[PDB]
């Protein structure tokens, strides 16, 4: 097929390239702990008033949305502009966990 | 300052002034001929596209440029093997040097194979190997890509990473070295007779007598001062070693060839980082950022840029390969006429009258040790164009008429050795009338 | 990102330096981000594939050379499955020879040396050698007849050098060789508008 | 019989043909254009819109033609190197005898005959190649009357009992006289010097 013939002759012919595909996936990030305050806010001694909603600065830390679950069942988890579970794959200049 | 064109010598011309050299030196010069640049293969998909499938699909739609480029590179590579075969494989049989390596004093030890070191390369070959920057040889290191190391000189590893593949020479460095050994063994033992068919043994003093006779120098000189020739030869070989090791400009030609190949490859690699007007220069990032429907334009532009870079690389490789092939035809001619024989073309096998030549394999080329004869210590004499005797003009058969100041001698034209003038070195043609400058003598 | 083999590194990464780069801007060395270890990134084993064959009218058996890779550790995965022994996980037996050029699969190594017919790479040459070692059919040996061997650079002649020995040729042949020199390629004219437009 | 005997000229013809075929296939390559037919491009999109596509196709075809012309220049430089080689072979091998080693055929070139072939020349390099070599004992000079003699034209060999000066490329022994050897020096410096006898052609005329 390479020689476009049916009577190929004696010799060595470069046909293709030998490749070895990878077989595993290794995704690793350097073990950052940097606990964002989410649980400590939600069970504080006293919250802030709704009209005077406290602007909690959520930055310089790593988010752990997996703990947003295991709260009271059928709690509203609406999200506007982005899915709640995909937030792990998104980065933000700032986050506000206004409560 | 104004360029000094040299010592403004005043050639002491006269109607009868001549200079005949009384002394000489055995100049073992050195000519470095690149013979075969490193053969290379460019996996079109792996270089231009890497592992990206969409890029390969788009490249196939573009046409058969990859096929033409691969055929051109394969032609270059088989041409490099052909260059080695024409330059080196000039004989069918392989000749082993005799154990008694005595040749009248011509110490070939630094050019003959070294049984002590395992490489069996000659010490001069070892110097040439060390001075020139090395190259990959596909060492079995169980690294997946033959040779490799951890946080070290991985430029060859990087080149294999990028898709450019330096295929090994067909004749290994040891096998190229053994072909060079066969050539040098035939030259030392057979002489010039192994390039015309069967190899015919002849001692080295006799071959050197032939080399003397082939440059208009009578062969008796090689034997009357045989020890002087041997000592000059050996000391010149030592000076060759000293100059090659000390002066870094000694191996300039082959080192420049290797550097040209390396910088061509480096420019190729940097083309991968060049944008050519694309949003970036990494195919994987382009694909992961933009889907193929919108990344198509950017990847197409990058493909065109890298294809142009590869095509320019292949064309300049063809140009420099024609240059290497011209130098390789020159090297084959120099082996046929200087190594496999004696070339009387002036300044072809080194400045001076070329005596003989010795091939020494160097990385991707050959060092010719052009043993030439160079005169020196000339003496001035009054000369004549003919010699009148008995009314007829005698002319020299082979030499030249010179005069001490009171005696006339017919001497060889390139080495002062006075001889009486008789009927055997001179012949009669005409009468002493039309010969202006004719000189009475006996 | 990268594709390759992560191996333990003998090189110590500076307290703040991130990941190794070579001279030609390549992600070669590395330090483990999660924990304080160092690794090296090795390119995957991809090389090439070449096909060594005699005349098709002479044989339908074959040999395959993988250039660059080494027979010992080469990940020869399932390339193509068919009745032929090549492109499988392993060959049918001892016909897997390791040379500097690469891995020759389907051809049996020979300790003897003949002239080079099909250059494989790094001094090893192949040949479809019809032999009676299998003691089978004359025109078809039992296994694949493709063998590899060290290239016999020729008959290892020993010019009998002696301080007094010479050779003179008694006879000769008026050889008539034949050298073909291309002189003038077909002169061509391209009407630019007719071709391009 | 052997199809590779005319390998070079047939290869040149095939190179020409394959370059032409590559040029033809360039009219089939899209080069990124919407198609690879000028008429289809003109008929599908209006010139204000088809201008970009036709410019892309023109650039692709022009670059392919430029590559063709440049590789024609390169292989024409190769052809011209081989053509100056052929002119020199005609001048020194055909119009004369060349003493350049292995220039007009392996062995000692005798003469050459031009034979025109399609787009090239065939030189029937009639060369002289020796064979059936006989071994002898040699000596770099001959000591007679206490002075050295060196061969004018030949080389000294010996079948075992007698020394003969022979032509250096065809075994033809001849006796040694003063007409084939010349005196140079004496027998104290030269190594390998051997005692022998060298005949004087003038001797019989001394009878009277
Ligand atoms: C010799 O000297 C010069 C150079 O040839 C010339 O002018 C002069 O006439 C010559 N005389 C004779 C006798 O050769
Ligand atoms: C000829 O030149 C060499 C230079 O190496 C010198 O050693 C030698 O003495 C010279 N010959 C004579 C007779 O002086
Ligand atoms: C040279 O010899 C001739 C006779 O052949 C004689 O006539 C002449 O005087 C001599 N001297 C010169 C200077 O010609
Ligand atoms: C020139 O050489 C001859 C040779 O015997 C000698 O007799 C003569 O004295 C020398 N003359 C000069 C000036 O060198
Ligand atoms: C040549 O013969 C032997 C062996 O090659 C060597 O050792 C010796 O020096 C030489 N003798 C003569 C007379 O050439
Ligand atoms: C020389 O060789 C030829 C073979 O080409 C042979 O026919 C001829 O008889 C030989 N000459 C002699 C004198 O044996
Ligand atoms: C050779 O001849 C010389 C005299 O011509 C004589 O003295 C000598 O003994 C002979 N033999 C050798 C080996 O020189
Ligand atoms: C050597 O050649 C001479 C020359 O006539 C001859 O008489 C003699 O028999 C030859 N001997 C051998 C051994 O060839």
The DSSP code sequence of D160-205 is: SS-EEEE-TTS--EE--BTTTEEE-S-TTT-TT-EE---B-TTSGG
* Token pair belonging to B251: 């191996």
Tell me which residues have their CB closer than 6 angstroms to ligand 6. C 171, 173
Closest-CA residue of D relative to B222 is D190
Residue of B324, B322, B320, B307 lying closest to B263 (CA atoms): B320
Ligand 8 and D119: CB distance under 6 A? no
Asked if the C-beta of D70 comes within 8 angstroms of chain C's C-beta atoms, the answer is: no
CA distance B270 to B279: 16
- Residues D153, D144 contacting (CB under 8 angstroms): no
Could B151 and C20 be called an inter-chain contact, meaning their C-beta atoms sit closer than 8 Å?
Answer: yes
Ligand 3 and B437: CB distance under 6 A? no
Residue whose entry in the numeric block shows the structure tokens 């035939």: B186
Between the CA of residue B212 and those of B209, B219, B353, what are the distances in Å? 5, 5, 9
CA distance B267 to B272: 9
Ligand 8 and D160: CB distance under 6 A? yes
Q: Which of D159, D175, D176 to mutate to test the pocket of ligand 8 (most atoms within 8 A of CB)?
A: D159
Could B202 and C167 be called an inter-chain contact, meaning their C-beta atoms sit closer than 8 Å?
Answer: yes
User: Which residue's CA is the nearest one to ligand 7's atom 9?
Assistant: D195
CA distance B414 to B416: 7
DSSP state of A66: G
CA distance B404 to B419: 12
Could C9 and B151 be called an inter-chain contact, meaning their C-beta atoms sit closer than 8 Å?
Answer: yes
* Token pair belonging to B184: 């040098």
Q: How many helices (H) and strands (E) does chain A have?
A: 1, 3
DSSP state of B434: S
Residue D72 burial by Cβ neighbours in a 10 Å radius (0-12, 13-18, 19+):
middle
User: Which residue's CA is the nearest one to ligand 8's atom 3?
Assistant: D162
Asked if the C-beta of B172 comes within 8 angstroms of chain C's C-beta atoms, the answer is: yes
Residue whose entry in the numeric block shows the structure tokens 């090395």: B134
Helix, strand, coil content of chain A in percent (nearest 5) = 10, 10, 75
Ligand nearest to the CA of D158: 8
Residue whose entry in the numeric block shows the structure tokens 């996936």: A25
CB contact set of B129 (below 8 Å; sequence gap of 6+): B121, B362, B363
Helix, strand, coil content of chain D in percent (nearest 5) = 40, 25, 40
CA distance B146 to B285: 29
Sign of CA dihedral D173, D176, D177, D181: positive
Start-end of H helices in chain C: 192-196
Name the neighbours of A, counting chains with at least 3 Cβ pairs within 8 A: B, C
CA distance C30 to D122: 62
Local structure of D148: helix, strand or coil: strand
Q: Which chain B residues are within 8 Å of A23, Cβ to Cβ?
A: none
Residue whose entry in the numeric block shows the structure tokens 């300052």: B1
Could D138 and C164 be called an inter-chain contact, meaning their C-beta atoms sit closer than 8 Å?
Answer: yes
> How far, in Å, is the centroid of ligand 3 from the Cα of B439?
8
> How far, in Å, is the centroid of ligand 7 from the Cα of D203?
23
Helix, strand, coil content of chain B in percent (nearest 5) = 40, 15, 45
Gap from D135 CA to chain C (nearest CA, Å): 4
Ligand nearest to the CA of D161: 8
> How far, in Å, is the centroid of ligand 3 from the Cα of B431?
12
Ligand 4 and B407: CB distance under 6 A? yes
Helix (H) or strand (E) holding B72: helix B65-87
Ligand 2 and B232: CB distance under 6 A? yes
Between the CA of residue B363 and those of B243, B401, D175, what are the distances in Å? 18, 50, 50
Phi, psi of D135 (to 5 degrees): -100, 145
Gap from A78 CA to chain C (nearest CA, Å): 34
Asked if the C-beta of D36 comes within 8 angstroms of chain C's C-beta atoms, the answer is: no
- Residues C55, C68 contacting (CB under 8 angstroms): no
CA distance B256 to B201: 39
Give the closest of C167, C180, C185 to D79, CB-based.
C185
Angle, CA B119 vertex, CA B112 and CA B145 arms, to 5°: 145
CA distance B334 to B343: 8
Could C44 and A12 be called an inter-chain contact, meaning their C-beta atoms sit closer than 8 Å?
Answer: no
Q: Which chain B residues are within 8 Å of D130, Cβ to Cβ?
A: 196-198
Give the closest of C166, C188, C195 to D157, CB-based.
C166
Instruction: Look at strands B371-382 and B17-28 and give their pairing.
Output: antiparallel
- Residues C33, C13 contacting (CB under 8 angstroms): no
- Residues B185, C75 contacting (CB under 8 angstroms): no
Ligand 7 and D2: CB distance under 6 A? no
- Residues B365, B34 contacting (CB under 8 angstroms): yes
For helices D47-89 and B292-334, give the axis angle rounded to 10 degrees: 10
* Token pair belonging to A70: 């295991």
Residue C18 burial by Cβ neighbours in a 10 Å radius (0-12, 13-18, 19+):
exposed
Name the neighbours of B, counting chains with at least 3 Cβ pairs within 8 A: A, C, D
Give the closest of C77, C118, C128 to A20, CB-based.
C77
Between the CA of residue B351 and those of B166, B310, B416, D144, D162, what are the distances in Å? 37, 41, 20, 38, 42
DSSP, residue by residue, C28-78: -EEE-SSSS-EEEEE------EEEEE--TTT-S--EEEEES--TTT-----
Angle, CA C23 vertex, CA C18 and CA C24 arms, to 5°: 100
CA distance D57 to D72: 22
Residue of C70, C80, C85, C72 lying closest to C146 (CA atoms): C85
Gap from C152 CA to chain B (nearest CA, Å): 9
Local structure of D33: helix, strand or coil: coil
Give the closest of C7, C122, C123 to B150, CB-based.
C7
Asked if the C-beta of B202 comes within 8 angstroms of chain D's C-beta atoms, the answer is: yes
Between the CA of residue D193 and those of B220, D141, D146, D151, D179, what are the distances in Å? 12, 5, 11, 13, 20
Q: Which of C163, C167, C179, C197 to mutate to test the interface with D (most CBs of D within 10 A)?
A: C179
Q: Which chain A residues are within 8 Å of B46, Cβ to Cβ?
A: 17
> How far, in Å, is the centroid of ligand 6 from the Cα of C175?
13
CA distance C193 to C195: 6
Q: How many helices (H) and strands (E) does chain B have?
A: 12, 14
Residue of B154, B143, B151 lying closest to C20 (CA atoms): B151
Task: Using the atom order of ligand 3, give the atom closest to the CA of residue B440.
Answer: 1
Helix (H) or strand (E) holding B267: helix B252-273
Residue whose entry in the numeric block shows the structure tokens 């002189």: C183
* Token pair belonging to B207: 């071959």
**Resolution in A, one decimal?**
3.6
CB contact set of B119 (below 8 Å; sequence gap of 6+): B126, B174, B177
Ligand 7 and D146: CB distance under 6 A? yes
* Token pair belonging to D202: 């003038």
Name the neighbours of D, counting chains with at least 3 Cβ pairs within 8 A: B, C
User: Which residue's CA is the nearest one to ligand 2's atom 9?
Assistant: B23
DSSP state of C83: S
Q: Which of B74, B97, B142, B158 to mutate to test the interface with C (most CBs of C within 10 A)?
A: B158
CA distance B385 to B393: 10
Could C72 and B142 be called an inter-chain contact, meaning their C-beta atoms sit closer than 8 Å?
Answer: yes
CB contact set of B403 (below 8 Å; sequence gap of 6+): B381, B382, B383, B384, B409
Distance of CA B196 to the CA centre of its chain: 22
CA distance B206 to D157: 12
- Method of determination used here: cryo-EM
CA distance B98 to B106: 15
> How far, in Å, is the centroid of ligand 3 from the Cα of B20?
27
Ligand nearest to the CA of B393: 3
DSSP state of B102: -
Helix, strand, coil content of chain C in percent (nearest 5) = 5, 30, 65
Q: How many residues are present in chain D?
A: 208
Residue of C73, C179, C23, C52 lying closest to C117 (CA atoms): C52
DSSP, residue by residue, B110-168: TTS--SSSTT---HHHHHHHHHS---------SSSSSS--SSS--HHHHHHHHTEE-PP
CB contact set of D95 (below 8 Å; sequence gap of 6+): none
CB contact set of C30 (below 8 Å; sequence gap of 6+): C6, C9, C19, C20, C38, C39, C40, C41
CA distance B65 to B52: 18
Local structure of D143: helix, strand or coil: strand
SS3 of B184-232: the string is HHHHHHCCCCCCCCCCCCCCHHHHHHHHHHCCCCCCHHHHHCHHHHHHH
Residue whose entry in the numeric block shows the structure tokens 């090659």: B244
Between the CA of residue B126 and those of B112, B116, B121, B183, what are the distances in Å? 11, 13, 6, 18
Q: Which chain B residues are within 8 Å of C48, Cβ to Cβ?
A: 41, 43, 165
> How far, in Å, is the centroid of ligand 2 from the Cα of B408?
24
């Amino acid at each position: 097929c390479t020689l476009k013939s049916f009577t190929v002759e004696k010799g060595i012919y470069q046909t293709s390239n030998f490749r070895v595909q990878p077989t595993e996936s290794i995704v690793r990030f350097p073990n950052i702990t940097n606990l964002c305050p989410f649980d400590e806010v939600f069970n504080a001694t006293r919250f802030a008033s709704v009209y005077a909603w406290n602007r909690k600065r959520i930055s310089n830390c790593v988010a752990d949305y997996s703990v947003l679950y295991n709260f009271a069942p059928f709690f509203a988890f609406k999200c506007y502009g982005v899915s709640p579970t995909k937030l792990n794959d998104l980065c933000f200049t700032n986050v506000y966990a206004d409560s | 300052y104004t360029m000094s064109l040299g010592a403004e010598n005043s050639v002491a011309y006269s109607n009868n002034s001549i200079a005949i050299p009384t002394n000489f030196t055995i100049s073992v010069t050195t000519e470095i001929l690149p013979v075969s640049m490193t053969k290379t293969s460019v996996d079109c998909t792996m270089y231009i596209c890497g592992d990206s499938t969409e890029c390969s699909n788009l490249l196939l739609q573009y046409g058969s440029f990859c096929t033409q480029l691969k055929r051109a590179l394969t032609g270059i590579a088989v041409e490099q093997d052909k260059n080695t075969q024409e330059v080196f494989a000039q004989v069918k049989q392989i000749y082993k040097t005799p154990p008694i390596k005595y040749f009248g004093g011509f110490n070939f030890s630094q050019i003959l194979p070294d049984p002590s070191k395992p490489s069996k390369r000659s010490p001069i070959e070892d110097l040439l190997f060390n001075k020139v920057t090395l190259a990959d040889a596909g060492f079995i290191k169980q690294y997946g890509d033959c040779l490799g190391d951890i946080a070290a000189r991985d430029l060859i590893c990087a080149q294999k990473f990028k898709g450019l593949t330096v295929l090994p020479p067909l004749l290994t460095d040891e096998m190229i070295a053994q072909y060079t050994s066969a050539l040098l063994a035939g030259t030392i033992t057979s002489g010039w007779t192994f390039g015309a068919g069967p190899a015919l043994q002849i001692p080295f003093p006799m071959q050197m007598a032939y080399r003397f006779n082939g440059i208009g120098v009578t062969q008796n000189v090689l034997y009357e001062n045989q020890k002087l020739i041997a000592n000059q030869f050996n000391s010149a070989i030592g000076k060759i070693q000293d100059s090659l090791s000390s002066t870094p400009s000694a191996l300039g030609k082959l080192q420049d060839v290797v550097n040209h190949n390396a910088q061509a490859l480096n420019t190729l690699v940097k083309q991968l980082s060049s944008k050519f007007g694309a949003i970036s220069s990494v195919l994987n990032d382009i694909l992961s950022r933009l889907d193929p429907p919108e990344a198509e334009v950017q990847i197409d532009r990058l493909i065109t840029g890298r294809l142009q870079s590869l095509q320019t690389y292949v064309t300049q490789q063809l140009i420099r390969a024609a240059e290497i092939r011209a130098s390789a035809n020159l090297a084959a001619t120099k082996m046929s006429e200087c190594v496999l024989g004696q070339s009387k073309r002036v300044d072809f096998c080194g400045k001076g009258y070329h005596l003989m030549s010795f091939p020494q394999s160097a990385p991707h080329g050959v060092v010719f040790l052009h043993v030439t004869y160079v005169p020196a210590q000339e003496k001035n004499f009054t000369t004549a164009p003919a010699i009148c005797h008995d009314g007829k003009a005698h002319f020299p058969r082979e030499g030249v008429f010179v005069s001490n100041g009171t005696h006339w001698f017919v001497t060889q034209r390139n080495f002062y050795e006075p001889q009486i003038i008789t009927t055997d070195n001179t012949f009669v043609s005409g009468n002493c009338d039309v010969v202006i400058g004719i000189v009475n003598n006996t | 990102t990268g594709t390759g083999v992560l191996t333990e590194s003998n090189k110590k990464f500076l307290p703040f330096q991130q990941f190794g780069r070579d001279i030609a801007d390549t992600t070669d060395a590395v330090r483990d981000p999660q924990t304080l270890e160092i690794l090296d990134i090795t390119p995957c084993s991809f090389g090439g594939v070449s096909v060594i064959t005699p005349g098709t009218n002479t044989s339908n058996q074959v040999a395959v050379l993988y250039q660059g890779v080494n027979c010992t550790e080469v990940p020869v995965a399932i390339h193509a499955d068919q009745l032929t022994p090549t492109w499988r996980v392993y060959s049918t037996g001892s016909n897997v020879f390791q040379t500097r050029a690469g891995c020759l699969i389907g051809a049996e190594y020979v300790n003897n040396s003949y002239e080079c017919d099909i250059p494989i790479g790094a001094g090893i040459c192949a040949s479809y050698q019809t032999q009676t070692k299998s003691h089978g059919s004359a025109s078809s040996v039992a296994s694949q007849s493709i063998i590899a061997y060290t290239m016999s650079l020729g008959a290892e002649n020993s010019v009998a050098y002696s301080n007094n020995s010479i050779a003179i040729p008694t006879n000769f042949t008026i050889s008539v060789t034949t050298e073909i020199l291309p002189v003038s390629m077909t002169k061509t004219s391209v009407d630019c508008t007719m071709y391009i437009c | 019989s052997t199809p590779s005997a005319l390998g070079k000229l047939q290869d040149v013809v095939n190179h020409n043909a394959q370059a032409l075929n590559t040029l033809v296939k360039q009219l089939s390559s899209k080069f990124g254009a919407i198609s690879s037919v000028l008429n289809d491009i003109l008929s599908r999109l209006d010139p204000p819109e088809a201008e970009v596509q036709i410019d892309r196709l023109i650039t692709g075809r022009l670059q392919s033609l430029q590559t063709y012309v440049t590789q024609q220049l390169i292989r024409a430089a190769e052809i011209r190197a081989s053509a100056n080689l052929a002119a020199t072979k005609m001048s020194e091998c055909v119009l004369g005898q060349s003493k350049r080693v292995d220039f007009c055929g392996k062995g000692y070139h005798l003469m050459s005959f031009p034979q025109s072939a399609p787009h090239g020349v065939v030189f029937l390099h009639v060369t002289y190649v020796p064979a059936q070599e006989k071994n002898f004992t040699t000596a770099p000079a001959i000591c007679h009357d206490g002075k050295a003699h060196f061969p004018r034209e030949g080389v000294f060999v010996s079948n075992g009992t007698h020394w003969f000066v022979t032509q250096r490329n065809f075994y033809e022994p001849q006796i040694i006289t003063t007409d084939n050897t010349f005196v140079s020096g004496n027998c104290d410096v030269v190594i390998g010097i051997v005692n022998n006898t060298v005949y004087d052609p003038l001797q019989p005329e001394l009878d009277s």
